[PDB]
Design a protein around this ligand. Structure first.
Ligand SMILES: Nc1ncnc2c1ncn2[C@@H]1O[C@H](COP(=O)(O)OP(=O)(O)O)[C@@H](O)[C@H]1O
Lengths: 229, 420
């Protein structure tokens, strides 16, 4: 984790209902196997960004979020949690959905999930990325699906691999890198419109140009907002 | 039925241009609204708010390292040619000299204005009028559902109507009816043979018939066996790729646009073959997200790449069927996430859908892939969207052996213009 002398700014979706700043994971009341997962990874104290992110994300019920912080802050960790803490392994079908901007980050965020979910039994990942093997007629029984948006949108729409009206969580990672990639922005927006209202929408980005901002607002309704200097 | 991941073909987009203003309502009815000059590098955008002529090189803007590829270029300099009535179709004779616009007025019924193209390039003519009309003599019935110009006979065009009827026209310095079949034939769609020697018309019973230009019936292609009774399809659109090679879109006869259309390749036998008709089926390739428009399939062959582009009214994606190295068969291609040709989401968050489709070959500008690497100029697929937005994508192809399809344009000389 990179050091951060500057402080986080938290625009809460509900101004008159403050809740922030967990300075420990034990405070969070995480599934025992998840909190073990966390320990396993050498995580000690939550990171600056997680302190504020996780409460919102892990609220009862959970809240939506748009988050802006630089690399090595703990974005991924933070959402890996988001998802795993909603995922019921015993239910063999996708419930959590993660759009990545490159193939080579869908795999990297995979490893982080798989490592963290280590102590969930029968937890399996699906990778909706260029050159997966899945023939038609098939349906996915993996509870999480990481991938890049087209291939994912293909999975919900055309190929009927995934029924998105069963997703509980939806992350968008690197929302800046995403918009600057052909197709992606529109592709993601079309995935999103078929998710169910209750689904949690989490969106993350290094930078935050108007474009990115404007984009966030089509995708993440009733959002809490976080920016770190 | 087969499919194939294609890594060596990529639609790489240029910046999106706003032409018309986002219409209040959804352009439901069937329509083709782009023509192109590949001879003299021009493009013809119609609509219910004028006709717009652009030098093609003005519509194509490469994205620099930094741009949002979804940000629009609002307006770009062209010609506006005002129009009393709203254009439901655009089209162009093979020599490149006759734009054929198709309107619907409330006091004439449907009609067809033929402009001479020199006129648009003729400065001393501020009012750019057409030289000939053609009063089809019908109201809604007369809606020009499909209209096509002979590929090698510039004077000859084949117009085909909402009501099932069809007529073949000659257009020189004036208009002659060569032939007209009445509604009771139930023509649904139209296409010339490659050499322009015959005309193929798809109908409502489900068959595609072949006609001499004088509408004499020569060959009947039966309705594919697998569409059994109770679920009666109808040709929707028909592409004569080769003497015995056809792309043929079908669809329900009960208009239940809820069902998606099926593309079919049809390899026909020959006079020394008593072989049945081989109909290979590549079902709903362009996935129908919509069911509010009446279906189109824009279709167009690229002979020197031996592949067929195909877009639908009711889908946001361009699909590609390619002929195999097998030389008979076909395959659907599957392209990378960021290498597709799809219409953007309206800023009101809805799907923009196709109004017209064209390929420009005149382009000379070489693709600036990165800082350091530049690739030769590619043909440019373009799309008119129901949002009034045009969507240029280069068609990079790298399959070995395929050759450069680029053709330099000309300067239309005014010589021989026809006056009204
Ligand atoms: N709470 C934490 N304590 C210690 N290290 C952490 C913590 N959270 C994340 N990290 C580590 O810091 C790095 C950056 O975090 P990551 O989860 O990738 O977020 P980001 O997307 O901001 O880089 C990762 O390699 C991760 O292992």
């Amino acid at each position: 984790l990179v050091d951060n002398t500057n402080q986080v700014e938290v625009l809460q979706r509900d101004p008159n209902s403050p809740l922030y700043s967990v300075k420990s994971f034990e405070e969070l009341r995480l599934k025992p196997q998840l909190l073990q997962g966390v320990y396993a990874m050498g995580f000690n104290r939550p990171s600056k960004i997680q302190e504020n992110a996780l409460p919102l994300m892990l609220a009862e019920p959970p809240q939506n979020l748009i988050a802006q912080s630089q690399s090595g802050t703990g974005k991924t960790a933070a959402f890996v949690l988001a998802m795993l803490s909603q995922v019921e392994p015993a239910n063999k079908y996708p419930q959590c959905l993660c759009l990545s901007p490159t193939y080579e980050l869908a795999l990297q965020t995979g490893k982080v999930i798989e490592q963290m979910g280590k102590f969930y039994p029968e937890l399996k990942l699906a990778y909706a990325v260029r050159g997966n093997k899945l023939e038609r007629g098939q349906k996915i029984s993996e509870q999480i699906v990481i991938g890049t948006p087209g291939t994912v949108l293909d999975w919900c729409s055309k190929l009927k691999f995934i029924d998105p009206k069963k997703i509980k969580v939806f992350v968008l990672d690197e929302a800046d890198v995403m918009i600057a990639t052909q197709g992606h922005q529109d592709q993601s927006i079309r995935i999103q419109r078929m998710l169910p209202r209750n689904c949690q929408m989490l969106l993350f980005s290094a930078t935050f140009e108007d474009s990115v901002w404007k984009f966030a607002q089509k995708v993440v309704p009733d959002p809490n907002v976080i920016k770190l200097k | 039925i087969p499919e194939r991941e294609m890594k060596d073909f990529q639609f790489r987009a240029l910046k999106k241009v706003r032409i018309f203003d986002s219409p209040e309502e959804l352009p439901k009815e069937r329509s083709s609204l782009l023509a192109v000059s590949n001879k003299y590098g021009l493009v013809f955008a119609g609509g219910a708010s004028g006709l717009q002529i652009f030098p093609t090189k003005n519509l194509l803007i490469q994205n620099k390292p930094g741009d949002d590829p979804n940000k629009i270029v609002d307006k770009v300099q062209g010609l506006l040619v005002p129009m009393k009535f709203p254009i439901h179709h655009l089209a162009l004779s093979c020599d490149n000299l006759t734009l054929s616009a198709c309107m619907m007025s409330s006091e004439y019924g449907s009609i067809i204005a033929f402009f001479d193209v020199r006129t648009f390039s003729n400065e001393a003519k501020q009012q750019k009028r057409p030289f000939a009309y053609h009063k089809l003599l019908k109201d809604a019935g007369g809606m020009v559902i499909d209209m096509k110009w002979n590929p090698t006979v510039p004077s000859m065009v084949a117009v085909c109507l909402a009501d099932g009827s069809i007529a073949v026209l000659q257009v020189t310095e004036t208009v002659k009816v060569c032939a007209t079949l009445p509604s009771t034939v139930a023509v649904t769609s139209v296409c010339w043979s490659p050499k322009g020697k015959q005309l193929a018309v798809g109908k409502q019973n489900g068959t595609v018939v072949q006609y001499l230009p004088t509408l004499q019936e020569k060959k009947v292609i039966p309705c594919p066996p697998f569409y059994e009774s109770d679920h009666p399809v109808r040709v929707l659109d028909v592409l004569w790729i080769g003497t015995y090679v056809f792309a043929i879109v079908y669809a329900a006869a009960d208009g239940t646009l809820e069902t998606s259309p099926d593309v079919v390749m049809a390899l026909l036998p020959k006079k020394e073959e008593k072989h049945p008709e081989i109909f290979v089926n590549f079902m709903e390739p362009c996935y129908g997200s919509c069911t509010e428009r009446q279906h189109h399939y824009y279709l167009s062959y690229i002979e020197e790449w031996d592949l067929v582009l195909a877009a639908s009214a009711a889908s946001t994606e361009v699909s590609i069927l390619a002929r195999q190295s097998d030389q008979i068969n076909w395959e659907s291609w599957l392209l990378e996430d960021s290498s597709r040709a799809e219409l953007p989401v309206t800023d009101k968050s809805d799907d923009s859908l196709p109004m017209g489709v064209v390929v420009d070959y005149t382009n000379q500008v070489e693709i600036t892939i990165s800082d350091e690497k530049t690739l030769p100029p590619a043909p440019v697929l373009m799309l008119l969207s129901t949002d009034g937005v045009l969507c240029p994508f280069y068609m990079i192809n790298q399959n070995p052996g395929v050759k450069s399809l680029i053709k330099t344009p000309e300067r239309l000389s005014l010589e021989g213009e026809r006056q009204p």
